[PDB]
């Protein structure tokens, strides 16, 4: 199942240990492999002690729907992953945020859902997990260790996030109007005005393809083309020491700017390497992150590099007839 980007699943020794704010790119990626970011999210917004993902790491997270394409590429970023990298924010849920039907919420400590205007996460505190409906947290006699397995984390949707090419407002408004034309029946998505109706139906599950282009709200689509392009930027490479683990911020910068480290076929072509020197020792090696590339989306006569893209369940109100 997938596998980790750099760091194998954590074996935490203390639920009370602090989470260190790391600056290196590969340092942050390592924390992402070990679900340190979801644990940080749980401690912040829910008053939860410890970690999730013991021995499992990010690769053993559970998904809705369970069969997930982007799950198989360890290098594709979930909304939580991009949040840790500061590309977006997964907000704490409020009572108004609609919990969607279909996921198996029972025994889950955290779950996350992309909404029409953002990304929302639901947490549980120490000693508790979600009921069957997801509406509440209830006492869970298996969670008091504070060192919980990965499948207690639920990521809803088949999602890939990346560095976007920002687009001007004119592009977004045109993209906005095309989506309105493709979905004339819809009124509100996740409580946010999509069209003007006055005549709405009750909220209803809505599996839709969308994309984040870094504006007011997302852009949902029916007919679109997706293409994966390769870009070989430094963010496509992670650097590790054999034995030590992820390289520091300064060692990673040196590797990616000075052709002084070792790497695989792709890394040496991009930034350069040097062999014939390596004694016993151990310096930093940088390898390619396993992904199809960057996703580029054609829609409504346009073509964008979006912040996020995927097919996920949102809630929609329809036109009354």
């Amino acid at each position, epitope marked *: 199942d997938s596998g980790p980007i750099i760091c194998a699943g954590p074996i935490h*020794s203390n639920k009370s240990a602090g989470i260190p704010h790391l600056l290196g790119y590969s340092e942050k990626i390592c924390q992402i492999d070990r679900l340190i970011h979801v644990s940080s999210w749980l401690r912040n917004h829910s008053q939860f002690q410890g970690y999730v993902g013991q021995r499992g790491g990010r690769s053993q997270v559970s998904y809705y729907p369970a069969e997930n394409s982007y799950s198989r590429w360890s290098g594709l970023l979930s909304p939580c992953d991009a949040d840790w990298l500061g590309m977006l924010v997964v907000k704490k849920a409020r009572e108004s945020d609609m919990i969607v039907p279909g996921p198996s919420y029972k025994g889950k400590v955290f779950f996350e859902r992309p909404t029409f205007d953002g990304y929302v996460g639901w947490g549980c505190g120490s000693g508790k997990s979600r009921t069957e409906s997801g509406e509440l947290c209830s006492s869970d*006699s*298996g969670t008091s*260790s504070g060192l919980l397995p990965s499948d207690r984390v639920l990521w809803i949707g088949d999602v890939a996030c990346q560095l976007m090419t920002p687009i001007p407002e004119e592009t977004f408004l045109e993209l906005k109007s095309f989506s309105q034309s493709e979905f004339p029946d819809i009124c509100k998505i996740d409580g946010i005005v999509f069209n003007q109706c006055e005549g709405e139906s009750l909220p209803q599950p809505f599996d839709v393809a969308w994309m984040d282009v870094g504006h007011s709200h997302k852009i949902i689509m029916r007919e679109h083309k997706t293409k994966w392009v390769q870009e070989s930027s430094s963010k496509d490479f992670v650097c590790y020491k054999e034995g030590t683990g992820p390289c520091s911020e300064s060692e990673e910068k040196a590797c990616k700017t000075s052709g002084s480290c070792r790497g695989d076929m792709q890394f040496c072509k991009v930034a350069g390497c040097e062999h014939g020197e390596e004694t016993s020792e151990a310096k930093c090696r940088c390898s390619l992150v396993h992904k199809p590339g960057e996703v580029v989306v054609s829609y409504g006569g346009m073509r964008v590099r979006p912040k996020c893209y995927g097919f996920s369940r949102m809630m929609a109100t329809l036109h009354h007839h």
Partner: antibody
Amino acid sequence: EVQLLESGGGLVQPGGSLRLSCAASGFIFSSYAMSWVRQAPGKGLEWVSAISGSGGSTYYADSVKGRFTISRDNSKNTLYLQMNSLRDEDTAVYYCAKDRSYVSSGFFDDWGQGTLVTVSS
Amino acid sequence: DIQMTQSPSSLSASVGDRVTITCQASQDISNYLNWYQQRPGKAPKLLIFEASNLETGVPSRFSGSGSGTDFTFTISSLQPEDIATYYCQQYENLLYTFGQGTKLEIKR
């Protein structure tokens, strides 16, 4: 506060079977993985088996796989080890141990007093 | 799978002296090594976890270090109650394995 009390050891002839019990108190049994570790007379420590907090994951050393079974009753707060097809290399003091996590992790933070199993005719 | 070796097998030192025990793994286990003390007639007791962390209540004269395959357990100043056999244990793999043990005699 945390205490583990083994019982069920004794004489058994080769090919025989035994069930060991380990009664737990002073902690939330169902939240923690448990392990069995044994020690032959005059020898070192040998990890035998482990089980997750709920019992959905079991693990065994190759020396005992297929002959031993680990289980737990989280309402009675006791841990079990069913040992079948016993041999002379199984003669040892058997300890139960409390782990630090729901998932088997390998921190043997609390130990029972041990119970002796002797395999001879 | 992962085999653990301890040296020395036996060791004699007197009170106030420094004691160092080594433990090696056949593969990388990062810092996933624990140290146990088994006093005569008693069950083993966890002294250090994650190769360097003192368990609660363990005196500061106990210490450990190492990452990868080579590890060390140190008693800075021997005390008579330290008479025991000391075991290292890897937990990188779920199938946990112990070292063979180091027996510590107290000279007097």
